[PDB]
């Protein structure tokens, strides 16, 4: 059915559509583990801190990892960036986020999640 497993960063709580979703067995730290294989949609916006607030001159980078190999590698000059995309996956896949410095992110208004893909056999 419908498994959208959103994760707010402020509350560190996985807002879910179902008690124990069919497609995901989530974790509290923001990581997750794929249950059912198929097509998915990683989504979410990542709000960075203002350029004034940053300490280190480390660049703004947001990556997405499937298991241990890299899936997505995004970077902009400290502006609002959305993440994700359509990706077909197998079962038991780790989907998490690694960014170079956890110090330069806005915990408020930052979210990420994954959705199962209903089949798309119609075209117009």
């Amino acid at each position: 059915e419908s498994c959208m497993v959103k994760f707010e960063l402020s509350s560190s709580k996985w807002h879910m559509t179902s008690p124990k979703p069919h497609c995901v067995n989530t974790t509290s730290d923001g990581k997750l583990k794929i249950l059912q294989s198929g097509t998915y949609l990683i989504y979410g916006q990542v709000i960075p801190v203002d350029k004034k607030y940053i300490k280190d001159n480390a660049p703004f980078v947001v990556q997405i990892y499937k298991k241990n190999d890299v899936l997505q590698t995004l970077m902009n000059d400290f502006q609002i960036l959305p993440i994700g995309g359509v990706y077909e996956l197998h079962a038991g896949d780790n989907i998490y986020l690694k960014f170079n410095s956890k110090d330069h992110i806005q915990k408020t208004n930052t979210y990420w999640g994954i959705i199962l893909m209903p089949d798309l056999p119609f075209i117009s």
């Binding site: 280190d56 001159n57 480390a58 660049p59 990556q63 590698t73 690694k98 170079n100 410095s101």
Partner: protein, 104 residues
């Protein structure tokens, strides 16, 4: 590069990996923690190159720690040469800018 260490890359991507790859081209440094690519961030004498970041490095050109030195732009804190354990005494002790000299 070295007999008991691992050569990877060519030209400016040259580095010596272990079984902590270290870019050997002067004033070139690892850009990623895995040192997949070597980047260019020169310093001045008496300074090393700190690299904060967990996926892609940013570079601060911090001064040399006590007990070390660096007389080039490459930004690497090489350890002082203790002439005493090598065979000589030390004429000038050495500082951040400069390494000690040995008296034959």
């Amino acid at each position: 590069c070295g007999p008991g260490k691992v050569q990877n890359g060519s030209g400016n991507n040259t580095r010596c990996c272990s079984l902590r790859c270290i870019c050997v081209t002067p004033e070139y440094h690892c850009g990623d923690p895995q040192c997949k690519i070597c980047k260019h961030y020169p310093c001045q004498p008496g300074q090393r190159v700190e690299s904060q970041g967990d996926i892609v490095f940013g570079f601060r050109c911090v001064a040399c720690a006590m007990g070390t030195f660096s007389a080039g732009r490459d930004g690497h804190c090489r350890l002082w040469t203790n002439c005493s354990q090598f065979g000589f005494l030390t004429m000038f002790p050495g500082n951040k800018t400069h390494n000690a000299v040995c008296i034959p």
